[PDB]
Amino acid sequence: SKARVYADVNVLRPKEYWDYEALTVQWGEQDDYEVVRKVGRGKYSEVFEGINVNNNEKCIIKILKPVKKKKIKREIKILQNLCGGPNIVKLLDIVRDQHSKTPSLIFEYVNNTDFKVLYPTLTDYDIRYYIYELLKALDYCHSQGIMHRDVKPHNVMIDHELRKLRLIDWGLAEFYHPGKEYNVRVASRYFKGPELLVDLQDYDYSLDMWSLGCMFAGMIFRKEPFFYGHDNHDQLVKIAKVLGTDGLNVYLNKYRIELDPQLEALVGRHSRKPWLKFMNADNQHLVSPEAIDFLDKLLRYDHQERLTALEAMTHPYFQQVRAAENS
Template sequence: MILTILGQCKLSTKPHQNHFENIFYYDDEYYQNHLHVSKVYWNANFNKRLKDVDPRYLYYKDGDIKRYTKYDKIGQGAFSQVFLGLRDDNEMVVMKELKPMKWQAINREIQVLKAIKGTTNTLQLIDAIRNQNKKQNATFIYQYLSSVNLLHLFGKLELPKIKLYIIYNTQKALNQVHSKGVMHRDVKMANIIIKEDDTLYLIDWGLGEFYHPKKRYNTRVGTRYYKAPELLVNNKQYDYSVDMWAFGCTLASMIFQKQPLFKGKDVYDQLDKIVAVLGTEDLLKYLDKYDLIYPDPPIHSQKPFTIYIDPENAHLVTKEGLDLISKLLVYDHKLRLTAEEAMAHSFFDGYRI
């Protein structure tokens, strides 16, 4: 790919192993100021090798499935089933059996898991065994943790634990994976697990994807109730901010004790539920700013997040919490707080670790 908009930016030639041996690329100032480029970590994947970010070039030595014995089923999703397992050295593991899918998707998940290896608050991949039988296309082996997901703890946590163990540590996990150039794209309560010692882990990277500036991505990703507005209006040039919207929904659900916060029957109704709170005026400004078309947008006036406060949740609501929610749940993804900015918010004062 050769980028050649002369007169608008400086161009230089450097080795760039993502695509070709040498390409022209825009300078940093161009990326930092571009409307359709992430405001953080936009260059995280610039110097990575093709085998690390492109599923077509992955080299991975598969493990031996004979080393593992499958036991009880402990979970199921749209694309996989999860079982407890035992390795031949008597080490307990988690075995994630993928349903039939394109080999590129399997390779991409392996690449994403390799990219985030070593980050805290994320489960580590132990082994991967790819195959072509009719029942499954691959089995991923993860470390075993005795844990429950956040959905099971919903309504049982007081504000200090919400701040310290749940919300702040989720931000740490997101900031670390974003710094590795990875978008999760399916952040939700069911994908946040808590160990008995209160350690938090962000799991399920099946929809994880590498971020590349100005790349057009599939918007049919994520769980409907947590989908960011840019996905609902088919803005394909999205970035890490989709995770921050989903995190904002998670935070608001924990504070207001309302799960999910926005409950649409389909993607159109989902946007309507969001607009019913954020209002039509700001949606139209967003669509105009990014030159997006959305026929017949729903018409609603803007409402404050205080509409969610009731006697059952009032003890969890603070001025700082409302402010953080209002800076995460905004239409414009360029104005949404990043994970690092959210971690620095006054809501977490006294709870940072």
């Protein structure tokens, strides 16, 4: 299986564009940036709001924990390749501690509102607007030969007042190479595409489209998250109970994949459930045939069947957002 779009980007570009292992970091000054308060974390970082001592402007300081240097260079190189793209978080500086050589990535500050509180407050149009902006970031990174691999609300910073969105967290992102087998241990469980759940390793940019679909379904159906599995097996089951086991079987046969016998047993058999059966009173002002048509074209087992980011931005669902932009 190969990507249907942007397959040759890294093929056509110089090795230095994608060979993140060769990257040579030019360190900035650790003193230029000081910590104000902790604002987030991951298994391999602590993230703080900070201030640029030189101009008193806010910034974000992502202090990285010990990991193979290759993992750090990858995040850095990807950020460097994408810096300036639409709605991509900007990496402003890279510094380290002189004694521990503890590295910190310095980013632009986004005055984010916790998604758990922000989303229930978004209007139908807000949803359309933010998904559109998020789509711009994804088409951009796909166009630059990169797969994000961790699309989820926690990695989408929104300054709601400034209607500004930034796709952050490029720490699991990879360069797309035709026919490469990737590690399937990426993305948050609730946002993992079928391909990851069934060991299809030759995946591509379309994985990010499943994740976006999951985010979108959560927003319009007001169900965070929408596919709530306890572990990877249970995640495939949660998907199968909505999408149906028919399409799954078609999918696995198309790609020659044997499901693990115990997994096959957990999944069982399920009818495809229509998207309106998730319709209720809290979400109603939010679903419409165009929302459903768009969602349906994202949440497909077959990654090759999913809309591309580009196609998605042209879907009728976003016509009002396009119109506003065009002025």
